[PDB]
Design a protein around this ligand. Structure first.
Ligand SMILES: O=S(=O)(O)c1cccc2cccc(Nc3ccccc3)c12
Ligand SMILES: O=S(=O)(O)c1cccc2cccc(Nc3ccccc3)c12
Ligand SMILES: O=S(=O)(O)c1cccc2cccc(Nc3ccccc3)c12
Ligand SMILES: O=S(=O)(O)c1cccc2cccc(Nc3ccccc3)c12
Ligand SMILES: O=S(=O)(O)c1cccc2cccc(Nc3ccccc3)c12
Lengths: 157, 157
């Protein structure tokens, strides 16, 4: 089955800048900062729809990876969708985790980051809170890492 | 004027550990990771209630600081309250900003971080969205930075 969860996050970062950092510069920033992500490599494509990326990261003291697919890109409306489709980093009860994101004008020149997660469980397995919350936690952690990088480097943004 | 805002975040980190990191190890962690925070000075007190900490940060293209005061500590119930009473880092429209935090166990094994922020505006003046959102953005940034550290160093926790 499909489980949907929507969330919004405000930021002082201007829309155009945030969108660029999250969708075009994130792979580069993630390997640059001291976070969980250790390496990102293109398995297929170079960024456009259909692209498959292998992301290797450290979960505690162990390494795992996920395969990521680029579902859609609407640069005109600052939209970007993609999903995690495999790898050892993907919970056993999950078949696919899809993200639908959009950046809109926020308050005081800042923006609003809207995200819709869609959990596709394996064999209609139930979605435990633990699995759902861990994904939200990782999604929130990654977002803050990029936003934080943007805020700390005004010459670049 | 006094404006209130609440929030809850679920974490996979056990209660006691998340609490120790946020309230006892954070001063050191902030200096170990590369974030906005540059230094933490104990101006008066040793960390117990009544303590005044001076926190300095590199806001990217400029520097600023805030005076933090420890309002209450309840180690038994994993409670910790404090507030920003001054510094160039505190917006002019604000007189004081208070935080009331608590960590409770999740029903399934994690922990939930509850936070209540109380904005004290200067004499009936309204609270601007920009000020409100920026404050929330920094609070979440700090929290996630500390949560990230624990998850990346299971050996230490
Ligand atoms: O694709 S990520 O941008 O890291 C990613 C981003 C946002 C939310 C995520 C949730 C679960 C797993 C991920 N991947 C993962 C990657 C390596 C090891 C373990 C898990 C998530
Ligand atoms: O009286 S408070 O309600 O905290 C307070 C409330 C509102 C604004 C304040 C500004 C400076 C100092 C305070 N007090 C203070 C008290 C003890 C130690 C350090 C500072 C302020
Ligand atoms: O993160 S703090 O350790 O207080 C902090 C430390 C050092 C310098 C700071 C400068 C501006 C804002 C802060 N924080 C802030 C957080 C929430 C609401 C309003 C201001 C600063
Ligand atoms: O807004 S900043 O200019 O970085 C910033 C400046 C000054 C003090 C800060 C204190 C805590 C968090 C921030 N932001 C943050 C936001 C997202 C992720 C990590 C940290 C602070
Ligand atoms: O849960 S972690 O084991 O760190 C983790 C492990 C593996 C891949 C991750 C990918 C994105 C975010 C995480 N969390 C995160 C949480 C807080 C701050 C920054 C990143 C990831």
């Amino acid at each position: 089955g499909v489980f949907v969860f929507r969330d919004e996050t405000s930021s002082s970062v201007a829309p155009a800048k945030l969108y660029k950092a999250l969708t075009k510069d994130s792979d580069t920033i993630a390997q640059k900062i001291d976070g969980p992500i250790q390496s990102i490599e293109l398995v297929e494509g170079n960024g456009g729809v259909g692209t498959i990326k292998k992301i290797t990261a450290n979960e505690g003291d162990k390494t795992s990876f996920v395969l990521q697919k680029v579902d859609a890109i609407d640069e005109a409306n600052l939209g970007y969708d993609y999903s995690i489709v495999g790898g050892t980093g993907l919970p056993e009860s999950l078949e696919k985790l899809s993200f639908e994101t959009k950046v809109v004008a926020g308050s005081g020149g800042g923006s609003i980051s809207k995200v819709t997660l869609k959990f596709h469980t394996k064999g209609d397995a139930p979605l435990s809170d633990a699995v759902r919350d861990d994904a939200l936690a990782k999604g929130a952690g990654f977002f803050k890492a990029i936003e934080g990088y943007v805020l700390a480097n005004p010459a670049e943004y």
